Design a protein around this ligand. Structure first.
Ligand SMILES: NC(=O)c1ccc[n+]([C@@H]2O[C@H](COP(=O)([O-])OP(=O)(O)OC[C@H]3O[C@@H](n4cnc5c(N)ncnc54)[C@H](OP(=O)(O)O)[C@@H]3O)[C@@H](O)[C@H]2O)c1
Ligand SMILES: Nc1nc(=O)c2nc(CNc3ccc(C(=O)N[C@@H](CCC(=O)O)C(=O)O)cc3)cnc2[nH]1
Ligand SMILES: [Mn+2]
Ligand SMILES: [Mn+2]
Ligand SMILES: [Mn+2]
Ligand SMILES: [Mn+2]
Length: 159
């Protein structure tokens, strides 16, 4: 089972200049909680944007070029990435935009954080078909002293 996890600002913006244009520790905590002890698949630009391995998860990096760090696993196609996860119950695809596009059609779940932030972007989440998806969990949070925007955790499951 393949899932996507992402945080989306207004207009589905997910990134700008190889970074996320917000800082929401509560959302990072949600990401960790939903990815720990699962394999994570990411594209090379996201690997560079994170800048180090995510602990406690098998990190699988897509790139057409040879890998440059044996602390993570490098693969050259979607099907190789899936295979490298092995027999696990849930594979987490953690972006970025190009990777989400390719995995969305295989995905059965989406973990989306909807952030109430206006931010210029150069990367978006796919313009997915809402009719394909059932919202099964929603949890809204107002901004607080640690988290400058309001945000909503949503889980959707393919109908
Ligand atoms: N808000 C969020 O939830 C979130 C999540 C993740 C990332 N981001 C942001 O998204 C941006 C990065 O996204 P992006 O779309 O630019 O890049 P990306 O999807 O992270 O990486 C794309 C690269 O992955 C490799 N790749 C992808 N598909 C491949 C395939 N089928 N076979 C082989 N290699 C493949 C290629 O590397 P090569 O060029 O080496 O071949 C490609 O250039 C950053 O701004 C980042 O901060 C945001
Ligand atoms: N909901 C969501 N939010 C994001 O920020 C996010 N980010 C990525 C890719 N980028 C990143 C960047 C940093 C960290 C990171 O440092 N995570 C730590 C957080 C520890 C904590 O704050 O509790 C981790 O161990 O997961 C993860 C993913 C992919 N999907 C996402 N999905
Ligand atoms: Mn805001
Ligand atoms: Mn429509
Ligand atoms: Mn919804
Ligand atoms: Mn709700």
């Amino acid at each position: 089972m393949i899932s996507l996890i992402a945080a989306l600002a207004v207009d589905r913006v997910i990134g700008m200049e190889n970074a996320m244009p917000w800082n929401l520790p509560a959302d990072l905590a949600w990401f960790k909680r939903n990815t720990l002890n699962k394999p994570v698949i990411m594209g090379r630009h996201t690997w560079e944007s994170i800048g180090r391995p995510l602990p406690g998860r098998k990190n699988i990096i897509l790139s057409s070029q040879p890998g440059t760090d044996d602390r993570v696993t490098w693969v050259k196609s979607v099907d190789e990435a899936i295979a490298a996860c092995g027999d696990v119950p849930e594979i987490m695809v953690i972006g970025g935009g190009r990777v989400y596009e390719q995995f969305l059609p295989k995905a059965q779940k989406l973990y989306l954080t909807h952030i109430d932030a206006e931010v210029e972007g150069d990367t978006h989440f796919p313009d997915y078909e809402p009719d394909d998806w059932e919202s099964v969990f929603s949890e809204f949070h107002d901004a607080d002293a640690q988290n400058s925007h309001s945000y909503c955790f949503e889980i959707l499951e393919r109908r």
